[PDB]
């Protein structure tokens, strides 16, 4: 139950505005930025600011604030999921969404803010379906806009029939200062890129633990998907029945499912770091990075960030493998390894100075956070088994998959 | 992405 979808800039003036109910005055956004700067200096910052009877649900984009005002008891999660879907629709029409895109494309953005939401209710937000009658380059609305299958326009014909899948892992990790693992979970996301012709009814098959326990294959390697968040397209009642993934895919890239499970396996890249921070003199980083995973796999282009003090000076970097650049913007060293094979153990020694006059304020201790990437490897052990293309016409498509292991928030705390 | 795919079976009969 939004009232007025505003789009601001970093100065607080209105890039574009679109009210629906009129319960919030159009000059109420002038009280957003002073209230945000007031709440900023007392630590009571919130995504829901308050000006009397006008609440400001807002998110922060690159240079943009998408304030969505409201007056009554608005459904808040509706408003925020609406705002991030508006961000996704604008970033699918526009290659980037900045201040230079609003004031140069106001022909289509008022049309979109009239089309996506009426009276405060989202009604049609699939951007690929929305490309068919709201163009920047008008016909009748397609039947896909009204029909139950509202994410796939019938009549799309390709030359080939390629089904691309990206079972991309993302290891989250949080190792404390003692050297023990606090939280280690994997947020994986199967990301498809569908090039199919017709109205296919795919049936994706996984090695789910519940499906194998109800099948009778309960001694092979099966992933215990602790939670799965499918897309809109997946028939969720049939998935709750017998763990079956049946859907009609959209046209283009999308995120099908987002599984999330825990990990009692060792961390992939371990960062055994020690810090000899002598006061007023210098600091030594005799850090090493061993790879606990298999010997075969090859971690491409990892970036092991290690936070340094704010005012370090005259760096020296005695490494073994992989160069060191020193980024004083983020105030951390970026120990970039180009190729990091499994089973190895690379040592690196950084050595700064430190000013002899002491600091005025505190410093804070951000974690060591790597940016690794391992192809052809799944930490979860999920294995897609099949993908039955079902089409009334009848053809053979080529389903392709690749497995990538990335990081999420792969943080390791310091002392 | 410079990574290459692997084809999956269709039916898993």
């Amino acid at each position: 139950s939004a009232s007025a979808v505003y789009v601001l800039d970093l100065k607080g003036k209105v890039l574009i505005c679109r009210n629906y109910r009129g319960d919030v005055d159009m000059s109420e956004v002038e009280h957003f930025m002073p209230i945000l700067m007031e709440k900023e200096e007392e630590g009571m910052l919130s995504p829901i600011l308050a000006h009397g009877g006008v609440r400001f649900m807002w998110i922060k984009h690159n240079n943009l604030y998408l304030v969505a005002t409201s007056k009554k008891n608005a459904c808040v999660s509706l408003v925020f999921s609406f705002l991030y879907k508006v961000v996704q629709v604008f970033s699918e029409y526009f290659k980037e969404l900045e201040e230079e895109s609003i004031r140069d494309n106001f022909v289509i953005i008022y049309e979109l803010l009239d089309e996506l939401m009426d009276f405060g209710y989202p009604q049609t937000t699939d951007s690929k379906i929305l490309q068919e009658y709201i163009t920047q380059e008008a016909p009748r609305p397609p039947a896909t806009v009204t029909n139950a299958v509202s994410w796939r326009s019938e009549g799309i014909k390709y030359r080939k029939n390629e089904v691309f899948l990206d079972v991309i892992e993302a290891v989250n990790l949080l190792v404390s200062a003692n050297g023990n693992v606090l939280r280690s979970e994997i947020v994986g996301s199967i990301k498809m890129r569908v090039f199919l012709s017709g109205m296919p009814e795919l049936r994706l098959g996984l090695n789910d633990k519940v499906l194998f326990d109800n099948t009778g294959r309960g001694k092979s390697k099966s992933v215990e998907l602790e939670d799965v968040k499918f897309h809109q397209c997946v028939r969720l009642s049939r998935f709750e029945n017998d763990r079956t993934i049946s859907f009609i895919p959209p046209d283009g890239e999308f995120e099908l499912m987002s599984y999330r499970l825990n990990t009692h396996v060792k961390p992939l890249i371990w960062i055994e770091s020690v810090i000899e921070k002598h006061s007023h003199s210098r600091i030594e980083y005799m850090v090493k990075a061993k790879s606990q995973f298999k010997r075969r796999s090859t971690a491409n282009n990892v970036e092991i960030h290690i936070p340094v003090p704010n005012d370090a000076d005259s760096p020296k970097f005695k490494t073994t493998v992989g160069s060191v650049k020193w980024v004083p913007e983020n105030s951390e060293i970026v120990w970039s390894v180009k190729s990091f094979p499994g089973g190895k153990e690379y040592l690196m020694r950084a050595h700064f100075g430190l000013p002899s006059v002491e600091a005025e304020d505190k410093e804070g201790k951000p974690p060591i956070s790597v940016k690794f990437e391992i192809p052809y490897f799944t930490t979860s052990g999920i294995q897609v088994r099949y993908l039955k293309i079902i089409e009334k016409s009848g053809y053979q498509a080529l389903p392709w998959v690749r497995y990538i292991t990335q990081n999420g928030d792969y943080q390791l705390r310091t002392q | 992405t410079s990574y290459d795919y692997c084809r999956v079976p269709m039916e898993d009969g």
Partner: protein, 181 residues
Amino acid sequence: EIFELKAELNSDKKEKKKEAVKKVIASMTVGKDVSALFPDVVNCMQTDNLELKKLVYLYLMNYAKSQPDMAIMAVNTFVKDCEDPNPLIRALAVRTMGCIRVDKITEYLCEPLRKCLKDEDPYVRKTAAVCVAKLHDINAQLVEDQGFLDTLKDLISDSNPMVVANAVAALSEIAESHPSS
């Protein structure tokens, strides 16, 4: 400064009035008091071009609160557009109807909304179901007197569930405004 804009706006060429209204809602975007130029964009509204009418409906929606007496010259155009064979322009006119917050206008708009609730093409129905809630926001007893709620409950028992979803949303909007009688 605005007089050349009005003179180019009261022309007869397509490329003149089109660039005129684009300049108008460009000045509306930056926050200029363009409210005084209201009854001159209303004359150049009835066009077959559809990329232009969205801008004029935008101007009628952002500036009917400030000019309440001047906005009486639009009702015939909306009840003309709510019979066009293009369903997009019908639903565009319908979602433009309810957002015009003038009490003197809603008494004439009850008939084409009543017709568009009984339309066949479900896009304008899922627009008009929310437009019923838009109209109930303005005058609650007017919608009860016109008896839209008993027609609105009949779209809940309809197929093609998007009209069902918007009708349930509008009914939950209206039943929140009632004292639960």
